[PDB]
A and B are shown apart, each in its own frame.
Chain A
């Protein structure tokens, strides 16, 4: 997203844009035909009834007939802690079920309790700022990252790009972290700034919430 590359069109058909008054503000992941998964802080201080959930999008600055738009029917949290940024996950049930096609597909999750060690290669993605120098991204961006444990907490999955200044940025909150084809992270927060090259980006650890997620979507 900072220092990444354009995704191939609809390469990640589980990717979702959350929008208010036309503006993308957070990402999300389609986890069932009628359930989207994002970060809790993304909806902590907004009018949820005005949130538009956009699936099948690639370039947010152009008109795309592939897109499917939904409203948020209800939300489910799992003890979000705004002070310490713990449990930063929310599930938004849609006002309907998405049509599953070449542009809109359901993501797949890891098993409960799965912890990823140092060095696992993952892909982050989102429509956030391109570094604030190019502004917000029009085309969905992706970035190759590696899981790290240093300068981080057990309550997060943290990623770094070694050797260059790259990482997630503002607007990427709620977007998935994909490792081995499974959604292991939801973008949560950065330290000091985007793409510092010194601190890892921190994601909500999806695998620690899987039990909870299932009790909502199954």
Chain B
């Protein structure tokens, strides 16, 4: 408690989603970047659904959507290597939805 926030996330690859209910742990009241978070999303994709960097690079689309505590959503293209140079609070992420489509 008070050490980690548990951010729910889902992974869909090619329209198929496993029906577990999973959470990504972030240090509570910490700050992170889009590089940190993108790397976490890529590691989740590989470990849980075997999605490789090569599969992301060659996918039709590969995104993840952050739902923020203030209700706004932001889509991040996993195929891009450009990252805005800001920091955001770990407490401000409510949900992450990862969606990869190979075609």
Any A–B CB pair closer than 8 Å: yes
Most chain B beta-carbon neighbours within 10 Å: one of A39, A88, A189: A189
Binding site for B on A (CB under 8 A): 20-21, 23-26, 39, 41-42, 44-47, 82, 85, 88, 128-129, 136, 168-174, 187-194, 201-202
Contact B82 A190 (CB under 8 A): yes
Q: Which 4 A-B pairs have the closest CB atoms?
A: A170-B33, A173-B86, A173-B85, A25-B87
Contact B74 A44 (CB under 8 A): yes
Contact A187 B85 (CB under 8 A): yes
Query: Which of A42, A82, A136, A194 contacts B86, CB < 8 Å?
Result: A42
Chain B contact residues: helix, strand, loop or mixed: mixed
Contact B31 A45 (CB under 8 A): no
Whether B70 sits at the interface, judged by CB under 8 Å, is yes
Contact A168 B85 (CB under 8 A): yes
Most chain A beta-carbon neighbours within 10 Å: one of B34, B70, B82, B84: B84
Inside 8 A of A26's CB, which chain B residues have their CB? 86-87
Contact B74 A82 (CB under 8 A): yes
Contact A188 B85 (CB under 8 A): yes
Contact A171 B86 (CB under 8 A): yes
CA gap between A3 and B59 in the complex, in Å = 36
CA gap between A173 and B33 in the complex, in Å = 11
Given A44-B72, A47-B70, A136-B31, A23 and B87 contact (CB-CB distance below 8 Å): yes
Contact B31 A128 (CB under 8 A): no
Contact A128 B85 (CB under 8 A): yes
Contact A171 B87 (CB under 8 A): yes
Beyond the given pairs A20-B89, A190-B85, 11 more chain A to chain B contacts, judged by CB atoms under 8 angstroms and listed by A's residue number, are A23-B87, A26-B87, A39-B84, A39-B86, A44-B74, A45-B88, A46-B70, A128-B85, A170-B87, A189-B82, A192-B81
Whether B26 sits at the interface, judged by CB under 8 Å, is no
Contact A189 B68 (CB under 8 A): no
Contact B33 A85 (CB under 8 A): no
Whether B19 sits at the interface, judged by CB under 8 Å, is no
Contact B85 A45 (CB under 8 A): no
Given A39-B86, A171-B87, A191 and B70 contact (CB-CB distance below 8 Å): no
Contact B86 A41 (CB under 8 A): yes
CA gap between A12 and B74 in the complex, in Å = 33
